[PDB]
Amino acid sequence: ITMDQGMANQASQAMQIQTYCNSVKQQVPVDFSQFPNLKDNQTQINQGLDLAKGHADLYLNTIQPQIITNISNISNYFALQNAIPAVLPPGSTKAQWLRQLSVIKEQATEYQRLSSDTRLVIVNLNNNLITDSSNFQGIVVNLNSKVQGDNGVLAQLNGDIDKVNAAIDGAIAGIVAGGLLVIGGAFVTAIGAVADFVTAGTSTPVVIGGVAMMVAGAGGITAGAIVLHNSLGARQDLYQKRSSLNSEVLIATQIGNGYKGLQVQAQNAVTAATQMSNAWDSLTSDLGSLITDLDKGITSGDDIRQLWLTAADTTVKTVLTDVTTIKAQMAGVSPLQVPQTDTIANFVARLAAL
């Protein structure tokens, strides 16, 4: 795997999980004070949610910065590489070459360590989310049995939501991935409720996993709304369609489906994180082989100079360009203002028809 794809994929996935985590943290705790036979159930829900907000926080506060630092190291690396054929003028001895390559390999290996450590901490996050996400599911089914509801209809909703959530995830990835590397590009995010929470009275909106992301320029917002609105509506349809499910249970299940959504974002992050480490490992081995071959009679400093100048003009200029535009996108990302009583699907529906 090339350094430009590993970087493009992790940047892309990070901006999506970032948004998702923001939606986790925005979720309000449930309110069942009306039915005192559910206090134990409320408590359970809200303790589970705080675990979900804990995982979200850990991602934004510990993992995201390392991802940002990684992107900056890719630039560090290639700028150091381009600089060597300038620091070592045409005479330069084999010794000089061995010292320079050995030094930049050291620096690169250190970047490999940051990236592999990151992969390891995302893996561990995911594993803890799988457990924490599976336990929440049981807190929902416990509540459902306590209101003598059908566990079978509940199950068919969870299954139906999981399939749609994957469609959403898919389209969002498509939007971000397709605009990520456009030189002037930016992104806007939208966080809203997965279901209507005002037509009937009791208002507990569920924004966890209720998300949308679009290109900020031109008619990017509209263009974005169009590919997103189908999948988003489909989900809202499933929570609004007539069902035997208690309302209190419908809330906890909405939350629970968002919780699941968080863990799938983590699993997507494992994938991207793995790809970026492998890109670093492939790079440190190539450097490793370059040193080894200079050390034998196979290559020379003059040959490496040649190889890194044609690289500096062709494949490196590309990478360094993308690194600039990627750091811009991630730092530039901006949130759309969503009306407090709106839904994410309705919001996007209306933006899609402008």
Author numbering: 7 to 360
Which lines from the publication concern this structure?
We show that the orthologue identified in A. hydrophila (AhlABC) is a haemolytic tripartite α-PFT, requiring all three components for maximal lysis, and we present the structures of the soluble forms of monomeric AhlB and tetrameric AhlC and the decameric pore form of AhlB. AhlC provides the initial single leaflet insertion, assembly with AhlB then producing an oligomeric hydrophobic pore, and finally recruitment of AhlA produces a hydrophilic fully active AhlABC pore. Structural and sequence analysis suggests this method of pore assembly may well occur throughout the tripartite α-PFT family.
